[PDB]
Write a protein that binds this ligand. Structure first.
Ligand SMILES: *[C@@H]1O[C@H](CO)[C@@H](O)[C@H](O)[C@H]1NC(C)=O
Ligand SMILES: *[C@@H]1O[C@H](CO)[C@@H](O)[C@H](O)[C@H]1NC(C)=O
Ligand SMILES: *[C@@H]1O[C@H](CO)[C@@H](O)[C@H](O)[C@H]1NC(C)=O
Ligand SMILES: *[C@@H]1O[C@H](CO)[C@@H](O)[C@H](O)[C@H]1NC(C)=O
Ligand SMILES: *[C@@H]1O[C@H](CO)[C@@H](O)[C@H](O)[C@H]1NC(C)=O
Lengths: 350, 350, 350, 350, 350
């Protein structure tokens, strides 16, 4: 029971998982599409060499014109003195670099803030289960006392007496939360991961703006082979002119990546903003019970605190641990009420 | 028992599962067929270049004419000044976009309304099994009292006394259903998912009506290569005329998608209408027992309510849980009768 | 025990399963063969273009003549003014449509009549095992009474007394069968599924008689390319004449499908006939036992009733459940008899 | 223990399993070899067309001459007016038909005689284990009386008394075997399956004798393309003459299939003959045991009875069930004897 | 414990398994290599046709010359009037035939001598474990008697008395072994399997000596195409002369197979000779314990008896069953001793 609970513990908020998967898979899918196009077309570019050229000579011209992009510029009939067509060649490599960059912050978070968070979460839930049991066991005596005397004054007095009984409030958790309220490691790692994601998105925007808009269309370009030693060969032409077939795929890939990351920006902004605000209905729900009372009194402090991230993970987990299904219904009963404690105790016993 | 039961709980209905599968598989199947045709034909189009052109020059003409669809229009000998043949090139990408759009509402529903619904279903069934056990436990005393006195007046009086005994009616369920009847999150998500499906179907209709009917046949088109820098090349022709071989596949894909989504429309309309009416024979069947009676008196309210969706999921689930295997036969016995309670109690005990 | 039993419950039948498998596998296998032939031949058709045509122009002619089947009708040199050769191109698509049509009634039956039948079978067998145990429990007292007095008059009197004892006859089963005898959902679904199978078989017959017999042989056909915008090109011929290589595969596929469905027709007719008659030796076998006696008195009514389908499934299942291996031997003993009950009781106890 | 025994029960004998496997594997393996040759050669036939013909025209001639086998006869330079070369084209299809035909009787046997045989076998073995236990339980008293009195007269008298005690002889088994001696379903299915196998073997012999010997060698054949519309084409030759490369593979396949089925004939003859004779040493072994004595006295009748098949499967199964390893040694002891019963009882107890 | 022992029983010896694997896999590996060479070379042979021949005509010549090996001889420039080059074509088929022939005796042995041997082995080991336990249980009394009186005369007298006690010597095993001494089925099957292996090895030697040495080198051969109907074709040459590329692979395959089977011959001879001699140190080791004494004194007759095979399998199995690790150490103690019995008894007790 315990071990399976530890394995099922969540250390990555459900919403951020989709962002991780998208930001790490989209460049990979685009790169796979680029490779598929490259291997389907046979040749990345095709050139219009004279009829005299044999098949081998034409293949040599194609290869030398396609491989001379990273090295020398090539100019089409709509451009200035020079235009750089290199991004056509360095597209899959840039996609690999972008995928690695996007995966890097995930690795940073996992290696830097998985173990402490796991330990804190497991310890807190282990304490909280028995804390809830101990809080519940007094409800029977509370109900008997209420039945004996119906006035509310005695009820409030006995509630105060139970609170002061010192049989609970777990001074361990009080000190632990007091210490955590000053810790900043988890918030630091979270904010750093989000900021890295945003910085890399801006970097991709800059890359696709500086190096892809200039040659976005660039239908054809006039290559040359005489730059090498074979300048005394009159057989070859001077300015063999040709084009590149994967231009449409390049344009698509670029636009698709831009759109995907524009979509992803606001999600990351919301994820970062989640820390600025303390986790409000649930707070009023859990304030009543002494077990959750201790951790609900810390909202006076600044929102940016390690406990805040721990609070987010507790809210994410407790939704499925099992301990949440009861107090929610109990507080729904309280809200509906103009008896409730007796019904809650009966349900818990059942 | 509880574990496997909560694993086996269904949260997507049986009928909507087929629609979800179809609306995401059909576009993928059509895309796979398009890619298979592309890689089987070797080239997407073939052009009738002069005999002087070598193999490499002919391949260059083919590639430049096939890649100049998204960029420039091409006109056949039956059209107006201009006709756009770009939908031929952007078919698989549009199919991918449509598949993602159709899959989006499923993800929205699963991320937005799976956990609350799961918790509500689990709590309701867990309480309902105990409610049924407690209710059936009193049939023995009912039988003894009925045997002692045969008149129906005493039977009715004792039935009222049992109802007022207060040993059941579970004030938890009463207040839970009262709260649910005002909630609108589940109905909102359901209606939003259905409306998204309808809107995306209409969008596909518009896309295939605007950008496929104009060039539905468009056998051939007249391409040109002189638009580039090689406008001084007298060797090449001026208006190389050629065609595209995947026209039949394009026409099929379009018609097939239109037919599939026309088929799917009415199913989604029925799914949306399901909420407009409360789930009648089963209602009369389950009204008798006190356990199901409590949720059977909420029919007065507006049909649109969170409880209605939960009612649908309970009806879908109880049909296989096991709890329904008895009351149906008991109410069949009641219908047959001009003793029945005794037979039902004996069957339950057995 | 109960779990594995309900997993092993059969809800299709041993015979109709083979028809279900064949009616879907045959079109799929034929389509796979057609695709294999298409990808092995490389070119679905080959045309006899002049020697002047280069390789690219010849490939263009092949593609344009093969793609102009579904759009225009081509004329062979043995025919009337015009003949339609489109079924050659639309063969695998028609096979896919036929496979989907064949699979549709199976899905209808599974989604429409699997759950009610499963529940009815489960309840009936669960009650019948206990009924058999209770019935056999009295054989000991019957044996003692028979041993005490050897005359047959007292034996018959005690048999009547046991029948009237009211310790069995399970009024639940009586009313359940009475209600079922009026139900018609299961018979309706069964008849609808079989009728859909027959209608689709007739539709395939019509399709292969209208659109395959006319062009069954159609060795060659005279194609044309000047219909496009190369009508002023004197280089091309006027009426390039050519043939299609997969003609034999087409002929085979057609004949094979016709034969397979002709074989399948009588099986479905027999499946429909199975409902018109109640299942006779087994009835005389099971009449004696009181538990089986109740369900054996309902044949006075029309054979077309919901209970009839449930009776068929009971006969199909009980053959392997275990509850049948004994009564068969007991009734074999009864037939062999000119003691038997004592031997049966001893065997059951052992 | 029981369930695993039921699963491990053999229902197809060990010898006929090899014939079943071979009669289906051989045609499938030959078909796979034919397809491998077809896809390795690239062209099923190659033709010697003039040098003027381009590559496309030569491929057209090849395809039209290879596809005109099933349609029109082709004559080689050693034949009469006409010879039919169709069997070259319809070889893999004929192999598929033969494989399906050979698989059909197996399916008939499995669907028609598996369940009754399984039920009879399981019932008989379940009764026989208890019968053997009861029979051996009396060996202790037999040994005691034999020790008390050494004369053989008292031994025989006590043997007769034990036989008449009526504590065994299981009247159930007697009546069951008496009923089975008249049943003919199992022998009918067995003989029908064997006769179907023999008939299909003879059919293959006829097919390979009528349609393969005539054109067994048929090196080359003179094709023609002018039969179509292009009879005014002076360019093409009149009687293009060519050959087929897979002739050796065809010859092999034919000879191999003939040899395999000639090998299989005698095995099936022996399988059929197995029923004509009752299974003798084992009968003398099992006659002594009272449990096996009952079925031993049933060979007075005709060997062709249902029990004969049941006897064959009992002999096949008991060899591994466990109930055979002891009585064989006991009867070996009896044969060696000029004490043995005491040793057998001690071994059984141990 | 028992069942796993039955599954782990060895029924094929450790040495003959390697011979089986080699003799069944070597031809398969050589066939795979031949097929790989065939599919890597593209054309099994290449011919030097004139320059006038187009590509299609050259391919036709290649195919017609390669396919005319099994039909007509081809003569090279070093040979007599005729030489047969067919073995080049039938090499993989001959390898398949050889593999099937080598696998046949294995199947014969497994189908004909696995069940009886398995039953005998399991029965013998089951009896022998109890025999060993019963024999060792008397060592305690033997030790007590030896301690009471130290003289060897009383020790020998008590040993004889224990041997005559009749509490062991298991007349079951005595009679079983006496019967087995006359059985010959197992030795017959073993000798037949070995003789089949030797005969098939000799057959391969004959096949490779008659049909491979004559044309072992045979670099080239002069083919002809005019033998058909194109004898009036002046365009074709008369005696197109060409070679075959897989000659080296053929030579290798042949030499490798010869070497492998020459290696395998002596191993099979040793396996056959194994039966001629009874298995000697172990015989003296087991001559002591009464459990193994019974089977040790059954060696007086001819070594070729059924028990001999049973003895071989017992020796092979007991090495790992567990029942041998003790008596070996006890007899080592006996050999080392000039005390040994006392030490062995103390070790057993410990
Ligand atoms: C074509 O070839 C000739 C001779 O090889 C050469 O003189 C001429 O320059 C070539 N054409 C071009 C455009 O270079
Ligand atoms: C064929 O080639 C010649 C010279 O290479 C050129 O003048 C002519 O225009 C070409 N014909 C076409 C139709 O392009
Ligand atoms: C053959 O080619 C020449 C020149 O390319 C052309 O004039 C003639 O029409 C062609 N033959 C046919 C049958 O079209
Ligand atoms: C070769 O081609 C010429 C012209 O294309 C034709 O007249 C002649 O008949 C052809 N040769 C044969 C054998 O058909
Ligand atoms: C070359 O071809 C011509 C005609 O195409 C033919 O007459 C001659 O015999 C061929 N050469 C040889 C060596 O056969």
């Amino acid at each position: 029971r315990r071990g399976p609970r530890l394995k099922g513990l969540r250390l990555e908020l459900p919403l951020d998982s989709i962002v991780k998967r998208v930001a790490v898979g989209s460049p990979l899918l685009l790169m796979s599409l680029a490779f598929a196009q490259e291997f389907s077309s046979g040749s990345p570019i095709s050139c219009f060499s004279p009829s005299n050229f044999s098949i081998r000579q034409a293949a040599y011209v194609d290869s030398s014109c396609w491989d001379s992009l990273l090295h020398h510029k090539q100019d089409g009939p709509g451009q200035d003195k020079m235009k750089s067509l290199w991004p056509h060649k360095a597209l899959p490599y840039s996609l690999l670099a972008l995928a690695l960059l996007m995966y890097l912050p995930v690795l940073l978070w996992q290696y830097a803030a998985v173990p402490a968070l796991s330990s804190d979460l497991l310890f807190i839930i282990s304490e909280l289960d028995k804390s809830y049991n101990r809080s519940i066991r007094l409800v029977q005596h509370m109900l008997k006392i209420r039945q004996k005397s119906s006035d509310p004054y005695v009820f409030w007095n006995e509630l105060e007496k139970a609170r002061k009984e010192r049989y609970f409030e777990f001074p361990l958790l009080e000190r632990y939360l007091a210490c955590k309220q000053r810790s900043h490691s988890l918030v630091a790692t979270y904010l750093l991961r989000n900021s890295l994601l945003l910085i890399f998105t801006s970097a991709t925007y800059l890359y696709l703006g500086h190096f892809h808009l200039d040659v976005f269309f660039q239908e054809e370009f006039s290559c040359s082979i005489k730059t090498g030693l074979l300048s005394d060969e009159t057989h070859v032409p001077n300015l063999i002119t040709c084009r590149l077939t994967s231009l449409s795929i390049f344009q698509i890939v670029s636009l698709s990546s831009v759109a995907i990351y524009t979509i992803l920006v606001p999600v990351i902004i919301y994820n970062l903003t989640r820390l600025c605000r303390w986790d409000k209905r649930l707070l009023s729900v859990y304030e009543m019970l002494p077990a959750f009372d201790l951790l609900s009194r810390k909202m006076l402090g600044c929102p940016i605190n390690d406990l805040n991230v721990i609070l987010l993970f507790l809210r994410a987990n407790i939704s499925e641990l099992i301990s949440f299904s009861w107090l929610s219904v109990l507080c729904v009963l309280k809200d509906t009420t103009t008896d409730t404690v007796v019904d809650f105790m009966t349900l818990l016993a059942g």
